[PDB]
Amino acid sequence: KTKEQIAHLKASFLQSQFPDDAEVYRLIEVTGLARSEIKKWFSDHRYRCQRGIVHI
Amino acid sequence: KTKEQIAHLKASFLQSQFPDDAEVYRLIEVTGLARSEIKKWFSDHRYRCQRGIVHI
């Protein structure tokens, strides 16, 4: 697989790890968590997800 | 943090790791990879992601 097509797969795979603020709002109203609470969670899970992908 | 809250965050985070076949269509026409080749890549990267999240 070329670097290009791998770039497209990651882009697509990672979309929902960077929620837009409509999605963050949606999360606030279903979770009751603070915006920054939600943000910290996502950032942390991205870090762990990527460390999973890189190690394997 | 409750199990309910974590469920909403997880459901959101994992969204784009299960591309619907409009998304996969978009990937075919942007990567030239087969439907099955795209599915195997995602599944593999779902596994690596979750192991990262589970073990870190």
Author numbering:
A (entry chain A), B (entry chain B): 446 to 501
From the primary publication:
Zhx1 to 3 (zinc-fingers and homeoboxes) form a set of paralogous genes encoding multi-domain proteins. ZHXs are multidomain proteins comprising two C2H2 zinc finger motifs and five homeodomains. In transient co-transfection assays ZHX isoforms have all been shown to function as transcriptional repressors. Whilst many 3-D structures of homeodomains have been determined by crystallography and NMR, we report two ZHX homeodomain structures which contain novel features.
The structure determination of crystals grown using protein derived from OPPF_2273 (ZHX2 HD2-3) revealed a number of unexpected features. Firstly, it became clear during the refinement that the two ZHX2 homeodomains present within the asymmetric unit were of identical amino acid sequence and were not covalently linked, unexpected for protein derived from the bidomain HD2-HD3 construct. The sequence of the observed domain corresponded to that of HD2 indicating cleavage of HD2-HD3 had occurred and that HD2 preferentially crystallized compared to HD3. The second unexpected feature for ZHX2 HD2 homeodomain was the unusual conformation and dimer formation. The change involved the rotation of helix I by ~180° compared to the usual homeodomain conformation, giving a more opened out structure with some disruption of the hydrophobic core. A ZHX2 HD2 homodimer is observed in the crystal which is further stabilized by a disulfide bridge formed by linkage of Cys494s. The switching of the positions of the two helices I in ZHX2 HD2 provides an example of 'domain swapping'. Thus, this homeodomain conformation appears to be unique amongst reported crystal/NMR structures for this domain class. However, the dimer we observe in the crystal structure serves to bury some of the exposed hydrophobic residues at the interface between the subunits. In contrast, for ZHX2 HD2 the rearranged conformation involving movement of helix I, relative to the canonical homeodomain fold, would disrupt the normal DNA binding site, however, protein-protein interact is possible as a homodimer is observed.
